[PDB]
Design a protein around this ligand. Structure first.
Ligand SMILES: N#Cc1cnc2sc(C(=O)O)cc2c1N1CCc2[nH]nc(C(=O)N[C@@H](CC(=O)NCCOCCN3CCOCC3)c3cccc(Br)c3)c2C1
Ligand SMILES: *[C@@H]1O[C@H](CO)[C@@H](O[C@@H]2O[C@H](CO)[C@@H](O)[C@H](O)[C@H]2NC(C)=O)[C@H](O)[C@H]1NC(C)=O
Ligand SMILES: *[C@@H]1O[C@H](CO)[C@@H](O)[C@H](O)[C@H]1NC(C)=O
Lengths: 220, 198, 214
């Protein structure tokens, strides 16, 4: 199966540089063109360029002519995208895609990598449980969650029961607090009858600060 | 009063020398006159040798095929008591895979795919179909946009012999030859997606 | 640059209706190089239509792509809730590759009232000197909901933050989270923490409350 796995989110100071990786698998790395796409927050898709791992030929969009550098390491089937002299409008999600001969379109995309250009200090979040109770029931349904508070920059990923619990989950878009730090909650509705036998653990990940927290949400 | 035959398969070519022979047996096997037409049935393709598009014998020759040449081409095969009009779509693409992935081979048709058999002594073929007026020199072979150099790889006429085929032989191949016509040289480059079966 | 002008920017329609989005290219684009992508919030774009009219794997028959030259169209013959996403046109004909600005398709469904839930601050957070109270409005429609915080029947102002989800791909509803944040000292100065929700689906405002500790 053709797969593209990118590196995690990063935060970098203005003027600095960032290198995003894209590990490929499921096909012959040198027989294809790897492309990079920029998605600025609130904006659509912008094409940055392409690299052929076979002959290391690169073709960039004139808009990224002096900003981007695309390289590959064929030994580990990995493409790299490097932005230099970072500025505010380089904050965006970056995707890698692959193109095959005779198929001029993008059928396979990486998951994306958020790059934040900021002078502010990276901070990992604090995870608090949002415990179920009598004021959290509705038709024999109970709501519970996790409050992922005070982190910078975006993003945090939240999963429930290591990915086994996805049904009824709502992970909210983060809010910017007056402090400059972000905060979000991730909730789930479950049967209140089994609150005594089931375990609900939220798994919070904040790659920029290397924070990985697991928090068990117990009934109050 | 001419029997129209519409061909279902389109022919794809890069923006380079290209030729198509009006071979439609047994219709073209008798004592017939073959005439090519471009998006027309009233003005035949010119027979001027110095013309970029011209008829050479029973062939339509593009030296080179360029953006704008895509369309329906007709071969009118006239016999004593018969007339047939074969309609074939000829499509040109501008770019080559090793230069860029943009605006190139629009789909992977059978004329751009080949297979090599695992563990066997097999070969790849370079398809260069041109009239006698076109002389083709030796063929250079490429894999993944680099020239092929190996002990298991041998060049023989239009074939690339591959001994002891391995799974690592999958990839994009390219065969290149110099075509000479009326004292002028042109370059032909064909890509091939090569897969392996056990 | 082949500029792709996509329209409309937003489309709000009911299930079973016909959705139409156009893309006008500044220069002629060959049909084998014209494609559409579907993108849901938080995810990578997904190939939807390729070669103008070919459906990508997993794309339902209700989707249809057509066009030539400088005019292309994506049509959904009978909308399902799972069609809510942003769609983008794309050309692979001439460098640089360009995409349209997108057409965000919103799905109009019947009025759904929110299920309201309230969460007192955790003991772990109270220990650190801060107290955040969360009010949750679950699976409602339309997205217009009004959440008021009341501490001992006193309407609060200036100490809360709201966040709404994208539209759900199965039921076309929205969910909202309101967090009231106070210091531990200010949290202890009051007893009744309540959030009152007003929505089109509620005949009278719903109030979810708790007494600090009790
Ligand atoms: N009677 C009848 C009949 C009626 N309706 C349809 S619709 C349809 C169909 O396929 O849809 C096929 C038929 C049909 N046929 C039966 C009899 C017959 N006899 N010949 C051909 C033939 O398809 N000819 C190819 C060239 C070739 O021979 N190709 C084989 C090798 O290709 C690579 C070599 N090149 C070297 C470069 O020049 C072309 C050939 C051909 C293709 C296009 C134009 C021309 Br005019 C010639 C046919 C097809
Ligand atoms: C190109 O096509 C022509 C047909 O238009 C082929 O010529 C025919 O060949 C057969 C077999 O020798 C003869 O019986 C016919 O009389 C020929 N017809 C004409 C009009 O010449 C020719 O062989 C093809 N050339 C190649 C290289 O494939
Ligand atoms: C050939 O081109 C014409 C004109 O665009 C088109 O209508 C027809 O479907 C094409 N046929 C094939 C076999 O591609």
């Amino acid at each position: 199966q053709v797969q593209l796995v990118q590196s995690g989110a990063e935060v970098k100071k203005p003027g600095a540089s960032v290198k995003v990786s894209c590990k490929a698998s499921g096909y012959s790395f040198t027989s294809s063109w790897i492309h990079w796409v920029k998605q600025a927050p609130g904006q659509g898709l912008e094409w940055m360029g392409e690299i052929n791992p076979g002959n290391v030929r690169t073709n960039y969009n004139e808009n990224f002519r002096n900003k981007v550098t695309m390289t590959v390491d064929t030994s580990i089937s990995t493409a790299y995208m490097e932005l230099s002299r970072l500025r505010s409008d380089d904050t965006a999600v970056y995707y890698c895609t692959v193109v095959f001969y005779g198929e001029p379109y993008f059928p396979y995309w990486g998951q994306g990598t958020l790059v934040t250009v900021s002078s502010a200090s990276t901070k990992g979040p604090s995870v608090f449980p949002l415990a179920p109770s009598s004021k959290s029931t509705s038709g024999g349904t109970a709501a519970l969650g996790c409050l992922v508070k005070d982190y910078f920059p975006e993003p945090v990923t939240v999963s429930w029961n290591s990915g086994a619990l996805t049904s009824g989950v709502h992970t909210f878009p983060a809010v910017l607090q007056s402090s400059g730090l972000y905060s979000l909650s991730s909730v789930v509705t479950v049967p209140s009858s089994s609150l005594g036998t089931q375990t609900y653990i939220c798994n919070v990940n904040h790659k920029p600060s290397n924070t990985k927290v697991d928090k068990r949400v117990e009934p109050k | 009063g001419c029997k129209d035959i519409f061909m279902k398969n389109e022919i794809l070519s890069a923006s380079q020398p290209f030729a198509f022979n009006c071979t439609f047996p047994p219709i073209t096997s008798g004592e017939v006159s073959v005439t090519w037409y471009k998006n027309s049935s009233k003005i035949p393709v010119s027979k001027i040798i110095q013309s970029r598009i011209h008829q050479d014998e029973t062939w339509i020759l593009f030296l080179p095929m360029e953006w704008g040449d895509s369309g329906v081409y007709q071969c009118v095969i006239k016999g004593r008591d018969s007339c047939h009009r074969i309609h074939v779509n000829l499509t040109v693409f501008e770019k080559h895979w090793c230069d860029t992935s943009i605006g190139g081979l629009p789909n992977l048709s059978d004329e751009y795919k080949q297979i090599l058999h695992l563990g066997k002594d097999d070969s790849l073929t370079c398809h260069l179909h041109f009239p006698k007026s076109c002389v083709l020199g030796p063929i250079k072979w490429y894999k993944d946009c680099n020239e092929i150099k190996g002990e298991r790889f041998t060049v023989l006429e239009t074939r690339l012999l591959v001994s002891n085929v391995s799974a690592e032989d999958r990839g994009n191949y390219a065969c290149q030859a110099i075509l000479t016509h009326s004292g002028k040289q042109y370059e032909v480059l064909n890509g091939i997606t090569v897969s392996i079966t056990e | 640059q082949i500029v792709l002008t996509q329209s409309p920017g937003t489309l709000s329609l009911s299930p079973g209706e016909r959705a139409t989005m156009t893309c006008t290219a500044s220069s002629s684009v060959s049909s084998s190089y014209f494609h559409w992508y579907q993108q849901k919030p938080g995810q990578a774009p997904r190939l939807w239509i390729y070669r103008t009219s070919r459906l990508a794997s997993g794309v339902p028959d209700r989707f249809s792509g057509s066009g030539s030259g400088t005019d292309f169209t994506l049509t959904i013959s009978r909308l399902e809730p799972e069609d809510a996403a942003t769609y983008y046109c794309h050309q692979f004909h001439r460098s640089p590759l360009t995409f349209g600005a997108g057409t965000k398709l919103e799905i109009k469904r019947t009025v759904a009232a929110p299920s309201v839930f309230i969460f007192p601050p955790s003991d772990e957070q109270l220990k650190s000197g801060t107290a955040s109270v969360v009010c949750l409005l679950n699976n409602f429609y339309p997205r217009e909901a009004k959440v008021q915080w009341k501490v001992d029947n006193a309407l609060q102002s200036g100490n809360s933050q709201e966040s709404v989800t994208e539209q759900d791909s199965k039921d076309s509803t929205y969910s909202l989270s309101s967090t009231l944040t106070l210091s531990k000292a200010d949290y202890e100065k009051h007893k009744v923490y309540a959030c009152e929700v007003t929505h089109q689906g509620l005949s009278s405002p719903v109030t979810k409350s708790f007494n600090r500790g009790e």
